[model samples]
Target: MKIGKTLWRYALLYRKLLITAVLLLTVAVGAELTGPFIGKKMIDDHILGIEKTWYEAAEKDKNAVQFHGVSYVREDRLQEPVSKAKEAHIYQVGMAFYFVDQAVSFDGNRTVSDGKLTITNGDKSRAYAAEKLTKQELFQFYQPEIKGMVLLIALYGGLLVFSVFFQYGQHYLLQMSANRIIQKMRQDVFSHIQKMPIRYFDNLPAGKVVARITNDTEAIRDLYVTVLSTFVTSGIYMFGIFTALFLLDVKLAFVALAIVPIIWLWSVIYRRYASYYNQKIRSINSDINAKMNESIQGMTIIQAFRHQKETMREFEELNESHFYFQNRMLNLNSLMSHNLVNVIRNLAFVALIWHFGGASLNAAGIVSIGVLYAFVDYLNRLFQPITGIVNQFSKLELARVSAGRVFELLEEKNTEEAGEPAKERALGRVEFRDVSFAYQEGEEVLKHISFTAQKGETVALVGHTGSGKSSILNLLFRFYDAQKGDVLIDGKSIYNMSRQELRSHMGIVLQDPYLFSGTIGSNVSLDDERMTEEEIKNALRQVGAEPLLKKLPKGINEPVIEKGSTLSSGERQLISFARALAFDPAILILDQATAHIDTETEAVIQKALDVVKQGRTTFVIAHRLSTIRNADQILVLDKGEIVERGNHEELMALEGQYYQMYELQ
Candidate 1:
């Protein structure tokens, strides 16, 4: 029911077009169904009307046949209602027409010998004096029906053309509707991805998320395009065939109704096995795509480390499972698809032959040849739709599983963004009051710690690895909130403002900075419309990146490829520093920002830092103790606790953990 509602809401996005498509489908089916009825009418009323009674007329007239110097009009065409006219008849024996002067008593096996026509039925036999009609006489007898047959044929042809037109219209509208539905759905899914929290991505791979948004949505598109259209069309077509059958014969219609349950049962049985396999198939397909994405993204590392065999093994396992389930589905389809339909279809025909042929033979006139012809035609038409429906079962199951996976992704909770508005200029005074936090339950990474940094103060945090230095920064940035303390900015709780608002006036330069694909100027400005070209160049100039720009043909406008891989490490780091300065953050963070730079580039950045950190509250997590010797405050962290805190000289004079660490370095 949940899946149904999701699909329903998507379909409702283009309900008008879908409704029109359905209406067009109905009209097309109605027009096509009219053909067999027209055939029956032409067969019984016009083509075979010659077998009816004929009468001798007083004078020759229209629709009157001349034979033996007399004009005889069929009883159906006698307009004046002549009384006591001598009755005559025409019968067919062995593909030849016979003229009898009087009406026959019964219909049965016919034979002619010595100009006597005998019809024997069981124990009864009747002989009549008959004359064989020549070809020209037979033509004259059948000539009047040509006009009526021509009209019926023309009508049938007209309905076919009408059906064709509407069929095309319905197909075009339905495909358009399907494409639009998928378009809207993909948009919704991608929008939902933006609302997700950063922590949500930590446990899930990027490839898996991409697969959910791309490949799985494409499978659902197939659902709307091929599967949905086929089932609806086949359903309406089958219903029309049954309606035609009921109009022709009640008992035969009831017998045909049994087919509906059989088809339903077949579908039920097929889905029982198919759903399992389809689920496996869809899941394995995602795994395959995810693995491929991961492998390609890390191709350089994998090949460098010679882990290709392991990677191939992992991918092949998923591939083998995919093939196994797909083969199972193939075997199931082969066993249950057209062969099953043919079996049921042949059974229906056998029942029809047993019931209809017996009744027609035992009691003449109980069923006309025209009715029999129509029943056969309608029955044959019925299986066409059945085949169509049966063929769509696999797609139906596949779409069901794919939709479930996509909805599962959407169901993940989005981070709350309802917070107070941000201020334009913050004082950059950040305080942590007895803060304690943990990424996982009962695994505290940051113990109770407290500190404060006033505006224009440069505070350096020195710690061993996993000593909660980064955790402190994470909490301040609101990536994860502290569990047992209050973090404040300018005497106001950080939680009171939205994350976007809190981070608007802040910037950080990571040790491994990620650069997007664009020109260096655009990368520095991050494509902010408000940042003019002059400001971008000014930011780079302030970062001492002028030498790097002078080396390129386009200066700051030089294009940076993926992750700025084409540039040197010092150049990339300089661009990152420029990026941070371009934003003019009031509170700046340098997370081991210069750890990978050479001595000359570090000396340049070290000089630029004095100018950049003049008025901002800067937090530095540095590995080289000498770099922070001039910092106003330095905190020595060990085992998630602040072990020592003082000015750099004071901590070194204290001869504690900070002094020991500085001496070791």
Candidate 2:
């Protein structure tokens, strides 16, 4: 039911396709039943009514009789046969008995008596003595019921062909629905991930999240197309077959259905095992994908550290475990299928033999041999749907697991959305008031970090690698809400504004810059088409990258590979600088932005920075103290605490953590 609900909810988006598939199924079922009904009529009426009149005419009139002693009677032959029968009592009695046998036996074989019977048919002729022939021999004959039989055969063939086409169309519609849902789900998850707090990703592997969006979504898609659609249509087919059987012969139908309850019980047991194994397989598969992705992405580091063999062993173990879990599911499915099919087939066979074997119903003349034959055919058709239902049960189990994971992700609370409203202010003054923050509870990353940058002031935060320089920037950006105290932008708490609105007013230039796959102009302008070529050029000039840009073949219009893989680190940094300058935000944060450049390029960057940093509040998370030597204010952090703060000269005069750190550098 979980899978059913999930599938129906997704299908609701394409209700027209759903309706169309259902209508096609209905038409297909009708066509499927028509052939069997025609077969029933052929057996009961045409084949069994062989002796009404034509049988005697064919036997007596030689001119009218053709091969097999079957007559095409002209009006001239009718009186001739009657008069001949009147002349010989023995011949007349024989003809009468012949007609009776033909009618009851439903046989088209011809006979002629001259103290013997001659049977002539296409490609063969034989003669038999009438006294030697048994009553069973007379009843065992077959009629050339080609007209009705051929029609019935054609209808059956049509059912098979149309069923294939209609079922394929249904799967096609399901695939369309599944693929659309997968695309939308991926987009939504990725967008939400992008908005998630940096700490959220810090606690979770990027590769694992990537696997969930790609591999897991693909798995769900396959299940929907192959398994989910089959289950629904097959169940419908089975229901129709059962209803038809019940209507035709309820008692015999009950006999053929002895396996239904057993199958239901087996499915219920298998469902639990299937669900458990499927969920386990998914979890292990995610782990394997995540591990492989991480190892591949960091292959150089793994090789350098000589951890490749160990990592490979870990992955192999994980994969082997997953294989066993998946194999268990497959084995159960196979068992369920084999057992159900055999049980249904054997039960149907036994029921048929027991019901029609003895004289209980036959002596009373309640049922005929032809009726029994039709019932067997119908019973076999009934089992087709039952087989489909069993297969669908397994698939539904797996789909349910996928749906649960997807919905769980959708339900995760977004930390970025937890806050109060932003206060309005004209000037962009940032203040960190007694701010204390922690990456985890009781493990503070920043302690009592108090600082203020008046409008247009540059405040540089300097420390060693783990001295919380980045943490300070994260706090200011509200990437993590502070454990104690508050960070205010424009005299309003960062928490008081929506993340998008708050972040929109600030720009950041990271150490390792990122450029999207696009033309150079597009990357610099962040795909804002409204940003003119002149604006793009001006921003590049502000970052001293215009000369470097001119060296390229198409200059600003040159195509950059994904993630700017084509550019050098410094060139990428320059692009980042251009992006920030183009935005012209009230607050700019440059976190080791020029660290990748050479000394000469650093001077060029510094000169560019001199022009770009004017009339804007800037926070610099500086790795190189030289970049911040002329800052309006400097804060020195150490082990989750701000040990010193002042202007560059004042910090140097302190001869404390700041002074010692500066002297060491």
Candidate 3:
């Protein structure tokens, strides 16, 4: 959660596209929920014919036809000139429905049976009709409305197509924006990992780091793409339904709105537990990943020691924990998503039916059947997004938790420090003046140790395990800073210079040389574009790796995969030596560089090493003290302090720690 600003900044980077999508989304929402109003119009306007039509034959007119205690107008008689003579305008007060030009209306109480309609005028007797209205006559009468219905069908068809266009556009633009943000986030995380100190990676597992880059970022992508899409569109869709509802009927609209608070309540309960389970799931997944990474790295040892059964048992336990919490999340989601939303939706339906059904019986205001149907339709629409809203909580919570973890790496300070790197060649006179350091407080690895290696002199360090041989080299390379005193080169404090500038002048070959997936030449050059192919071949030859290059079909460009697994240990060591020579730095640190090679390979490397170290100040840390007898100076370390220092001959003359180590060897 640290500064969540990093992730947020990535989103703001592409706001233009996002904002356009949002605008289209609103229009798309409007197109969808507007369907219910059309349903109301169809029921109330055209279905009932006239909604309410009345025709009194001429209450006591001698010309009125009377039959079976009823007076009414027959088709032929109504069409006669006398029947149509009186054309007085009928006055009516308030009702939201009615459109006509010579409109023929029908009365609800008027009975139509046996091809005859009993036109009752409410005069204690069925009104007389000249004759019952025929189907042909009714069709002729509703001709205007029939035309309007055809137009409505075309309008609805066009509306359907229009909705389709904008809905697709809305979805396309939104997902595009989601991908852009995801790209930015992954790019930033990888970029941030590059600048961090080696110490940060030493404690974190490789598999967990990969999950942050891949799995966690994927979850974050779903947050923007799936969760936000559902959440915002659902909210807008629900809001439109309610707005249409209240306008149609305030009393019933309030009942529909009651479902909203239920959703809020569900969200309150679900978010609390959902976020908790999601966090557990991500953490557990990371643990399983770490275990897998550890097991894979040590599989060879596990097999050699016949500990496969116990190793598998441990890994199974971690996997079981990961799967167990995943199930908890799944169970929780099932309860909150569809199930809870359906209950609230059904409740709304029942409440609406009870309230409006009873209201209509009390002879309520001219609320048409259309209005009732419209409310139910809109209410049903409201629950659609409600269900979506509920379902997306699981996705949203996962994204939030994963994003928090992803950005956590960004918060760690790059311990490499800050300064401009040197562009010029450096004079490599290195000094350690009272230098002291510790990996942690109150536990110094090197203490009060002072030394000097004049330019072009070889300083050999001889020591037993944990006697600070590597600690001195670590400080010299600036992998860690000294807590006390200073490490200087050419009389300038190394800390005052950037790590890049300091390391730029030194070449290192470690005890176990590491190689990445690339061609051998690329690995040797290591991003130095200035290294030519001929120079690459020359460097390999200088390291006594000429035979190694001939073995590969591709020569210097030989494919060297992870850890250079296909190459022998001696071959990899030779490549490491060649890489160091390729750089031609001011100082050379061969820290047990020949430790992995056989006796034959070590002899060949000595000759190659001689040529390379002739002009550079060299520091060689070796447990095999026999090789350093000709060094210009030798320092014997004990318990983080230098106990003996002099030329190899002088140290041997003292017969102190160096002499004892030489004798023991």
Candidate 4:
């Protein structure tokens, strides 16, 4: 499956919350974008509105300003049109306001010298007798707009307050949704591991698998938490800012649009390089986890063998590679992130300066101070989101690489359980017909061999190491299927049944048994709901494990650490025997179970084995020739071939390899 498609499917599980969060984000953006327009209005209509033409009012009124004992109202505030002769204006010249009783012909560069104000426009200039107003007189001109300015100030602040509430709401909702998505994704990854075949674990270490489920998924969580939120918010901000730009100035807006393609191009190149380094980083991180797990698991051997220096050297190599990739990633970000954004922003500002400052000096129409202020404000706002996006590049690449690795694991083929279900327990009849198998192709470990064990019969397979003994059992266990033959249980091809169904009634005690981290009783019953306390105790008693367990104060409840490392090897084996016995399997396999047991423990286990073998088909792989003397059938195997088969006495009379092996022992 494609990584994007899989991640999208997982995101859809919580779409409603995400959608709500986006809506709130849009609301917040609207509130924030309104700020510059209000500022432009405050500059144009309130603070600068006093410079408009004034007219002598017909009568004194509240909107009129008292100047030189005469009331004059701004042209726009007059109740009715005043006569042309009454028209008057105020012009600012060098930080001083000049009251011109007569209207100026053409406004331009202004100079006042010796009680006369001269206005110049190109070749045209005129001088008018003007009275300079005092500071108190100038204050009257600004009085009318203070109320309007106050209203606009309150409006801007109110919009900001409104935006803050929605900002909090959106952030809260987005984070909640992100957490939920990662939580569900982690569950899916964990559940998928269960459906993976035993062969999958054969190649990948447990620590690497754990890293995928833990570390890679965590990186993906950062994608949802930080990268997703930043991108979405920044995207909306950019859209709103550009819309405002086009509305304010079409030529400048088009110039700003160039940034879009630049950013896209830069992002393409960034991801290309970032992904290369990030894949190496994530891979090395997994290797580090695997190495740490291996070191801890083999610490006993490592310390005893004095292999600390070599182990540390190997670990340092992995760490060095990890640091190299991380350092490269850092360099990539430093080269492009804030520095690149700042350069682009500075260029945009320069263009803005040229557009208004340079053009106004040479063009016929002058740009308004209010418009210039608004453009600068919007330009500053524009780069904020751009910088935000640039800063998230590293996280974006990390997550993309992490998500790809996670999806790859999810895509691994799982063992399908679609075969016929066994309705009843398998009876203890087992057979192998002309089985030929290999762990690797063309290197056959087991040659053409056939065998059968009738119900209630005991079969012992004795052979030198790697003589196809365990290979035969591997075929019967279906851990690896033979390429050229068939294995049958209860006269039915095992392939016809699901692996779980075929293994349901079988039990195996390995040469080195494994125990999980749990109490002694839990290890015995494996937390099976079907095993009662009495049943667990009975199985332990049957396996002669009660005496060893009783030495602990908690007995059956005693804690067993990982791999049962705290327990003696014989004690671990006894618990394993009880575990297999508690299941009450119809067919039992003992693969060199007594290889490392003390003589006293072996005596107890041998007696338990005798009781465990009755009325069930049993297969024993033992090194001791004395142990299988009463077996109904003994097969001697060597070099991928079964060389001899018979009872001990029969093989002895034949003077075959089995007889020689028994005599040598």
Candidate 5:
């Protein structure tokens, strides 16, 4: 009933299809019951009568003989010689002989048959006779019933067709509902993830996010259709079978039902173990996906360092862990199936044997041979639904784990921002006042950082790799909000502005530039429909990429492969520079943007930077301080604090941290 309620809520729109399917199943069960009844009738009236005739013939063929002053006959002579006798008297008398041996008198008298074979009722004696079924009599007894059975068979065929159509309709509805639910779930998760703050992704693995969207959703899909429908269908079918059994014979029905409690107990025990192993399997699968994605993405570094053996060992360990959980789950499933099925089958067999062996109770017995056979068939049928219910429960538990994971992702909060407030700053003036940031608690990356870049000035930040150079860019972009103080552009708080508007006014070129798969011009302009080919070419020329473009067979139209792997690092950077310029942003950020280029490309890039930043606020975080010699100001960052600030010449004269660092380099 829990599963039924859940499915109804999940599939409310498909209730009509579900009801039609149930009706079809009811008709199918009715047809199944009718078949057994027809079989029982044929056995009792026709086949059993034939056996009685053969037994009587055997008695008469033995002929009458005296033994201990009583008449007796050989069993073989009663059947063969009498059945094949040339005379009619021999045949009729022989076939009727068994009736004389077992006759009962109506008047409180017993008949002892000798050669006369008689029944006695208080001195009134009569010879016993057995009537053979003549052709006309046999026809009269069975013709109507036979015709009814034939019509029942045709009805059974029609019921089968109806069942097929209705069952298919049910599946179609369930699958459609399941798929729609999954699609909605995926969309919600994706949109929620995108809304989350950049800091959320900074600490989370790419593979884990992939797992949430893919594997987790697939698990939910399985539960929606297979697990949910199996529980509902099996429960209803079992109930119907039980009702039919009780209607046919109450005593035997109770005996058959005794197996139900045992099945329930076993399922409860197995479900516990199955759920534990299923969780273990699910965890191992997640780890394997994470590890494999990491390994592939880091393959170049692994090869360069010649760590192939170590990497292979790591993969092997993950695989072995996965194998252990998979085998454990398989063993539990196999054991549950074997034990439950055997226990029920043996119990049914024992009950049938006990009922068949009692001779004295046969006259007053609750059931006959034909009825007992039908009951056994129903008993076997009942176990299947029980097993199905148990299996579906295990699957449901597995899917629940996935659903929980997906929901967890969906519930993550997005970064807060002020709503729809207007800021009318046309000229960009960037300022940071006492800013500090930390990716995680207790590990500060920047501290008390204060700087300003007026509308047409360039500011360069220089420090060692871990000296918080790039962290400033991250903070400026609002990728991570500062733990202390604020960042403002033209007197407007960056966090208060919408992300789309803030990003639209800023352009960035990184050391390792990313070029998506597309044509050269497409990558240069980021496929922005607003930028024409002329605008793209102008931007590229400004970035000094004109010579590189001319060398290409198709110039700007040349295709770029995955990650722009077909181009050199310098070429990729040129594309990034052109992309940023094409945006015509009010502020430009270059983070070691010229680090990969040779001297010639560096000169070209410097010229392009000069042109692009002509009237825009520019911030450069560079490894080489010489490149920023002409900056309006140079800031030295060390140990999360800005220790020196001035033009390059003024910083050189200070002979402090910046000068010492320059001399060492």
Candidate 6:
């Protein structure tokens, strides 16, 4: 029900076309159903009703005509009632009609003076009247009726054309609305994912995330386009078929309408079973995409480390599950959709025939011949969509499950903001006044700690793995809120600032830099209009990556495909360093930024580092204590707390944790 509600509300946004499509479908289906009735009339009227009418005409009027040796229809009398066609063949047994030299016979009732054939009410008397008519008048009798049948045929043709036009209009409207709704849905889901907190991405696999954005929305698109064309039209068509049936014979109409309850029951079971299996299929599909992305993202490492077999093993699991679940769905579909429903449909036909054709027939309740003809035609129209709907069940359920996940992503807490906390100020001073944090509750990663970095001063953080070095960076970056205490920038609480506002003045270069599928320069500036071409080159120059330019097809414009897979770690490090310098930030945070660069590049990086410290308040997290010997303050962190804090010389003189760490390195 929730899934239905979500989809309904989403689709309702384009209710105008939805409503228009429904209305158009009604007309189209009505036009289609009308064809059966028109044909029914043609059968009941010209093909069969004319015969009944002729007999009724002769019996009601006492038209007794005597011609030669036989007596049946009167010449002038039968014309007044049965028309001239019925006036033929009253002289039969031995014919000698000299008028037009044609033989005449009785109207299958009484033949001659013997009065041989007598069966129905008017057959004897109608034969007498039929004998009074001539060959010339008989041809003229049914001319108007043949013309009438031709007109009915033309009317049927018109109805068919009308149905076609309206169906085209209906489908066209439905398609337009479907595309528009899906477009907005995809856009909304994407926008929402962007606003979710970084933690959302951490737990979810990139493959699943990509599936939500790409494959899931595409399944939804198929539901709208491929499935909807049949769904609504079939609904209206069934309604019309059942309504016509009910009017004809209430009991039999219900027999025909047994389809509704049958469908409902089947759908209920199908939904129950399919929801479980389709959800599994959806999950496996996401995993498959995730594994594919993981493989692609780490292809270099996979081959370099020779982990191809492991990758294949992992991928095989996802693939097999998807295949297995899909097979399950197919099995269920076979049982419930066509194979099962067809058997039931046949059984219903048998039951209807057995009951109506035998002693169980309620003569008064039996449907008229015309309605029965209509029933067959409209029943066919009704089943067409039902078949399509059945065929779409597995796919539709899959899409629904996927859409649910998309909505789940959309509903995640949006911690992302447009980075506007305070006016764009030159934020240089930084302070962590008794800051504390935990990624999860009851297990704190950061204890209440205090630190202050004056403007243009460098603060170095040295800690073992899991000693809360990166967590501090995360807090200062405002990627996650600190559970306790406060981090400050320029004397204002950092929490008060939006992500975009706080990060605007800061530049971060991590140990591993991830580049986009674009040119190197785009990575540095990130398409920011403020970063100029000159600044980008100058940044690279300071990193002493000038020799790197010679290898490039286009300096700064060199393509870094697949997250810089073509480039070495040191090269990627150079790009990241250049990226930070290009931003020209007031605050620089280097979380082991120099770990990837070689000694030659490190000498250049060290020079830039000295210049960078003087220009901005810097926070550096590094394991190599030798690099931070000139830092204004070196913080030695143990567990979550800063155990020692002082200048490099001051800390070395004390011979504490910081001093010991420096001596070891």
Error of 1 at 625 (Å): 4.0
- Give the TM-score (vs. native) of candidate 3: 0.78
List TM-score per model, in order: 0.84, 0.73, 0.78, 0.82, 0.72, 0.75
Query: Pick by lDDT: which candidate is best?
Result: 1
Show model 4 residue runs off by greater than 4 Å.
Answer: 58-64, 72-86, 223-227, 265-336, 362-366, 385-388, 391-401, 419-422, 542-558, 593-611, 625-630, 652-655, 663-665
Name the runs in model 3 displaced over 4 angstroms.
1-10, 52-143, 209-215, 271-340, 359-367, 394-396, 413-419, 534-558, 593-600
Q: What's each prediction's clash count?
A: 0, 3, 13, 0, 8, 15
Model 5 CA lDDT for position 590: 87
User: Would you list the rank order by TM-score, best first?
Assistant: 1, 4, 3, 6, 2, 5
lDDT of 6 by residue, 406-442 (tens): 7777666754756354456656988887877888688
The lDDT of model 1 is: 0.80
**How do the residues 1-665 of candidate 4 rate in per-residue lDDT, one tens digit apiece?**
67778888888889998999999998988889878978987897767777678888755566778888888888677765546547788888888999988876577777889878887767446788899997988888888888888899999999999999999999999998888998998898888887776677777899999999989998888888765688887888888888877887788889887788988878777778887887899899999999999999989999999999999999999999999999998999788877887888788778878888765665344556676677778878877665456546644766888999898888877655444445787789999888888787899898888889988556988887779887776777777878888889989998777877787768888888778776777777777656566444435445444444454312345567657877666667677777777787888988873554567667656766776777788998877877788889888889988888788889889997887777786
Clashing pairs in 2: 68-120, 421-496, 422-496
Best by TM-score: 1
lDDT of 1 by residue, 559-645 (tens): 576677766666676777777877888888887734445776676566556766778989888787877888878987788888787
Q: On TM-score, who's better, 3 or 6? A: 3
Ranking by lDDT: 1, 4, 3, 6, 5, 2
Q: Root-mean-square deviation of each candidate, in angstroms?
A: 4.8, 7.8, 7.2, 5.0, 9.9, 7.5
Determine which window of 10 residues in candidate 1 has minimal summed lDDT. 547-556
Tell me the spans in candidate 1 whose CA falls farther than 4 Å from its real position. Answer: 56-61, 65-80, 123-125, 273-334, 385-388, 394-398, 419-423, 517-563, 593-614, 626-630
Write candidate 3's Cα lDDT for 1-665 as tens digits. 54356656777888887788877877776766666677677777766534343333554543233333433333323444345533211212132222221333333234434423343334324322224333454444355466667877777677778878888887898899889888888887888777777677777899999998889888888878764588776777777778888888888877777766788888778878877877788888888888889889988998999999998898888788878888998898787777766777777678767876676455333547788788878877666666556557645655778888887875666545445667987787999899888886889888899998888557888788888888877788777788889989999998888888898889998888777567676677674667666444434445444445554312345557656777766667667777788788899998883444576667656765676677889988866787787788788889988888877888777788888878887
Error of 1 at 323 (Å): 9.2
How high is the lDDT of residue 39 in model 5?
Answer: 59
